[PDB]
Amino acid sequence: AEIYNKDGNKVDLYGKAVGLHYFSKGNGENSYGGNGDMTYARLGFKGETQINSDLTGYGQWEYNFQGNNSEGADAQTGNKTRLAFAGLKYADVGSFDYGRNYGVVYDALGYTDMLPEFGGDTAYSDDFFVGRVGGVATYRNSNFFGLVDGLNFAVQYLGKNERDTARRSNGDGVGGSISYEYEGFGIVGAYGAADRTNLQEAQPLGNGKKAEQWATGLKYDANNIYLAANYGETRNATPITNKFTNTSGFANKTQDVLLVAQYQFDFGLRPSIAYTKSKAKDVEGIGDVDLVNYFEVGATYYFNKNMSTYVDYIINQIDSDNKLGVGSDDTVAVGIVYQF
Amino acid sequence: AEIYNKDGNKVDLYGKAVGLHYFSKGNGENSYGGNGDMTYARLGFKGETQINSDLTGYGQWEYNFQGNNSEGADAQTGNKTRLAFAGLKYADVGSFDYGRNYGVVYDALGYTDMLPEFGGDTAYSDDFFVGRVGGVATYRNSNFFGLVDGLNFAVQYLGKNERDTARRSNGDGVGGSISYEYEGFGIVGAYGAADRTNLQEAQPLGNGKKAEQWATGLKYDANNIYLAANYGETRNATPITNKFTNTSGFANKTQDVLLVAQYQFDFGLRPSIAYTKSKAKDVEGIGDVDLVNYFEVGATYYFNKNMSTYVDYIINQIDSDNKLGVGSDDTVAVGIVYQF
Amino acid sequence: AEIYNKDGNKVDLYGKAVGLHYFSKGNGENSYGGNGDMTYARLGFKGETQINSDLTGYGQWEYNFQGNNSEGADAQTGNKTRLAFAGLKYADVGSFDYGRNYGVVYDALGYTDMLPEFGGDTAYSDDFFVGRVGGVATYRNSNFFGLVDGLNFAVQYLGKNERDTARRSNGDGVGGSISYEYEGFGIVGAYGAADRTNLQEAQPLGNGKKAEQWATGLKYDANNIYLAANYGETRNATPITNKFTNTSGFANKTQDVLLVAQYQFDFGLRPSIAYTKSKAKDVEGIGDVDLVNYFEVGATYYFNKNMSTYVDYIINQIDSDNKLGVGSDDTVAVGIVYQF
């Protein structure tokens, strides 16, 4: 909510409280999403200052507070900063920001990342260009320097992050995206490539000096209708785990497909259906293997812009003999959300 | 403080900074509260949206930031989310919320939880129904569907939380409360029972498949006077430690009594006296033993609704030969509070 | 930003988002500041209530969120409360506050702590009187009871903090400062002494029952010109370590000098140059050794009061064979800052 607006600067303090519970058979270890309390809250700020008629500065920070920990030793589990960045934007010239922000391939993956609770499976955090990541410099242009309404593009430099785990590390890289969005119609392409670190190359799963991710998307988003599809491929970039050898690494190759269809009734009910499949190829000791494979059915009821409730049912198509030990059981989430 | 109120939604951002110090002889290991700096701060939001004339949605998050840690490796000690939940309240039919919230037995223990600093000794956090707890679904009714002013009841479902420690864990359970309040007089009773997890049963102290907690309360709150008392008992629910054998678990039985008397002078000073005693029975290898036993004298001076200062003296009646090694020395707390 | 002001209470919710990157050769281990992404955010509140015409109450809390961590196991690295205190101020009698706050010798060190990104090297956190510390009670007096404009002094009591590390510990102590400012000129002095804890005394480096810190300062601060010098000495108070081994402790003596010169152009550019040298003496097994030794050239460009950008170049004079393994390579920081 806008809590401040004076003398050229405005500040939006926002957040939400989500009462959230997952249901899956047994103890949830062999299911899509687990089971139990999944309650959490968010808090963030977003600010924008008018420097002159054409130039604006901005900054944003957003944090995740888990609500399903005790007040004991596990208190901090799953807590983190999601975003933290600042930037400048000028009229029709474009914008530039640096910090922790979305990687550019998410410009495409956002198309299908629309489910009430799940979905968006290939948009991993700290995974090069497909999700939120640290140390990215991003230039964006809207409406092609003012010449073409609906045409956007972006260019992004990812600085290396040599962390303690292969999973969360990355080398230097660059990526970009282009989209055209007009009267409800949208089409997007995005690509990114980067060096892998020594720690990454040392894991038994995944082999290569460079990581690559790309995706395309199509959508129609108008008249209470939302339809969208994504297709993309990755090289040495999707994190995986072989549960039978207790080993982790990256998929040599993946091909990823996502589909979503939603409809919003005037009285506030928004039913949702979706399909997601991500498969890995040339995985050491395995070959081909599904990582994600399901149909979704769900719905959100919007009381208003501040309050909603939802159910999200994942009909999990992973098989009980999945070679990596990916969970094969269904999961249903039920949530109630206050937000501001 | 209300920092947003527009289009049917209002948001309160609140918090406080508490400069706080405890004094006890020695290093304070053998005292009621310990000694040293105990400064902390809090931040939270509380939101309420009017959905229509009969229906409101709401959400709340609250966090504790310790102010007595270094900026080094102990930085996070004692920090946690206290509350995180969202809910709906309908006309005279009731409210429902889910998330991290107060267990229903605290509906009773709230009566004596009124001391400037100490007190409320039996309202443990992450302990089934007596304090803040994770994954509780709570139904509350005010004025018995509109028919009886002052008559309230609550029914509460506690989802299991199989955590890393027995102390912070619980199995599935249900609880309830009922209270009548009128013109300053209050009377209340509350009860809940839950399964214990495998990890709790495996602890050396405490035996049985079910945990139970109940309490009764009476109070008078009006005319500058506050008088209240609680009596309750627990089974397999109160966490304890044998400091001699470094063993932990739960007391097979406790009975608990709390008394408080307070008076508020118009000029700001509010003296307080209290008595608190919690005793355990059938404790493995010990039998009967007092967990808590003291008289309290203290006072708060309110400068106004935002600034106050207080002193709180605990005259500890625990004996130096206590069988569980519960601290016997006194503690005095001194605090200065700014809040918003 | 002031987000609430009503009925004699006002609340400032403030913060910033800083995209920040450091460049140093190799992996940054042997450099002044390290290398890589250093992005972070701050959030805080500052509140003030008018109790009566002469009496005011106040509280402040301030927190650092690192933006250069992943969302995995390392998420909390470097996160901490910086300040948490509350207090009262009366007419021309003075102010008193208690909690986590700045030690009084920082009243002197503030003179040179003015660089775009670095500098202020001797104002250590959790280090007796030179930086932020927990459990300090501080009296401050403005304009000598209102009789001498520009004359200010402070007296401070530091309660003991026995922590798990000697680095972050302290015993009881007292300090004070005094300063005079007239027509752009300022002179300041500050001194503190305190007991060392047993754990501090057990460390291989540094010998004595008392830690002492003092610093003097001169500045000229007017007509867009900023010039300042600090001279100070410490005894058993400056923390030191050998980079290559476990040996750690405090320097028996240090001699500290800091110089700064800056000019603020009306259009927004503020170039900066500086010199900092901190040298330890009588170090067990070593004798004399430089802790800090550098020249700085940098600049901040201010778009307005909410947006700025900077570069800060540390030209490191520390030698590659420094006895304590102090990093010898340069570091440059580049930053973009949105604040409210």
Ligand SMILES: CCCCCCCC/C=C/CCCCCCCC(=O)OC[C@H](O)CO
């Ligand atoms: C119009 C929308 C109104 C719809 C409101 C619906 C309320 C849903 C309640 C879910 C309870 C959870 C039940 C537990 C589900 C079983 C776990 C599971 O999915 O696996 C079983 C197996 O797959 C065979 O289906």
Ligand SMILES: CCCCCCCC/C=C/CCCCCCCC(=O)OC[C@H](O)CO
């Ligand atoms: C798989 C990757 C797919 C990527 C696909 C990216 C789309 C690229 C579009 C380029 C040029 C389109 C030219 C559009 C020129 C429009 C001219 C104009 O500005 O008119 C607007 C209209 O008249 C206002 O009403």
Ligand SMILES: CCCCCCCC/C=C/CCCCCCCC(=O)OC[C@H](O)CO
């Ligand atoms: C006085 C005025 C000063 C003007 C200063 C203007 C520059 C502003 C830059 C903003 C953010 C800089 C963010 C830097 C992002 C680059 C990340 C990077 O360089 O990665 C390196 C790679 O990992 C290994 O070489």
Ligand SMILES: CCCCCCCC/C=C/CCCCCCCC(=O)OC[C@H](O)CO
């Ligand atoms: C379970 C799987 C089911 C999911 C199925 C997903 C199908 C995906 C389609 C993608 C893009 C569609 C692009 C269609 C282009 C729309 C343009 C259009 O129809 O314009 C109408 C106009 O606005 C009227 O006024």
Ligand SMILES: CCCCCCCC/C=C/CCCCCCCC(=O)OC[C@H](O)CO
């Ligand atoms: C548009 C209005 C309609 C609202 C639409 C969304 C709300 C419904 C949610 C419930 C879905 C329940 C269906 C789930 C049952 C599937 C279980 C299953 O098939 O999986 C078994 C597994 O294979 C064993 O091995």
Ligand SMILES: CCCCCCCC/C=C/CCCCCCCC(=O)OC[C@H](O)CO
């Ligand atoms: C489109 C319409 C959307 C419809 C949405 C329907 C309800 C929504 C929200 C309610 C959340 C309440 C969650 C309550 C969780 C209680 C269950 C529980 O605690 O289970 C523990 C477990 O059984 C241990 O064994």
Ligand SMILES: CCCCCCCC/C=C/CCCCCCCC(=O)OC[C@H](O)CO
């Ligand atoms: C451990 C003990 C637990 C006990 C828990 C409490 C039990 C309460 C029962 C409620 C009775 C309702 C009697 C009060 C009804 C008042 C009459 C009425 O209906 O309204 C009055 C009206 O306001 C004119 O002033």
Ligand SMILES: CCCCCCCC/C=C/CCCCCCCC(=O)OC[C@H](O)CO
């Ligand atoms: C079930 C448990 C119930 C517990 C019951 C707790 C109350 C106990 C009272 C004892 C004596 C009562 C003596 C009351 C003395 C009142 C004196 C007084 O109030 O004077 C009035 C004055 O004229 C105008 O303020």
Ligand SMILES: CCCCCCCC/C=C/CCCCCCCC(=O)OC[C@H](O)CO
């Ligand atoms: C350590 C010493 C602390 C001991 C504290 C124990 C007191 C317990 C009281 C319990 C219930 C109080 C019920 C009393 C109800 C009286 C109602 C009343 O006073 O009526 C006022 C009248 O309506 C307008 O003058």
Ligand SMILES: CCCCCCCC/C=C/CCCCCCCC(=O)OC[C@H](O)CO
């Ligand atoms: C009803 C009115 C009650 C009046 C209450 C006034 C409160 C004033 C200030 C509060 C806290 C200040 C605490 C000061 C603590 C300083 C450190 C200290 O005293 O001790 C360190 C320890 O002794 C090492 O041996």
Ligand SMILES: CCCCCCCC/C=C/CCCCCCCC(=O)OC[C@H](O)CO
């Ligand atoms: C009105 C009430 C006033 C209360 C506030 C007054 C505090 C101010 C102290 C000034 C210090 C200026 C510098 C201190 C001088 C350094 C002492 C010193 O040189 O110590 C020697 C060292 O041990 C090697 O011998």
Ligand SMILES: CCCCCCCC/C=C/CCCCCCCC(=O)OC[C@H](O)CO
């Ligand atoms: C041995 C001696 C060596 C000789 C070296 C001398 C060379 C001087 C260089 C000055 C450059 C910058 C001067 C800028 C002029 C200041 C104008 C000004 O500052 O006023 C405008 C406002 O301050 C801002 O917008």
Ligand SMILES: CCCCCCCC/C=C/CCCCCCCC(=O)OC[C@H](O)CO
């Ligand atoms: C913006 C208006 C124009 C203002 C322009 C201001 C330029 C100021 C230069 C002073 C530099 C002092 C730096 C001193 C460096 C000494 C260190 C040294 O002697 O050696 C470093 C060498 O790089 C080791 O290899």
Ligand SMILES: CCCCCCCC/C=C\CCCCCCCC(=O)OC[C@H](O)CO
């Ligand atoms: C809800 C409590 C009733 C209100 C009382 C107000 C009396 C005021 C002062 C006396 C307090 C001591 C009496 C409270 C003791 C509770 C019962 C108890 O402690 O246990 C003995 C009992 O016979 C079975 O255990």
Ligand SMILES: CCCCCCCC/C=C\CCCCCCCC(=O)OC[C@H](O)CO
């Ligand atoms: C040489 C110092 C400038 C380097 C800054 C790096 C920022 C990078 C890109 C933005 C440049 C826009 C700033 C160019 C300076 C414009 C000065 C101006 O117009 O503002 C003056 C002031 O507002 C009157 O009050």
Ligand SMILES: [K+]
């Ligand atoms: K490999």
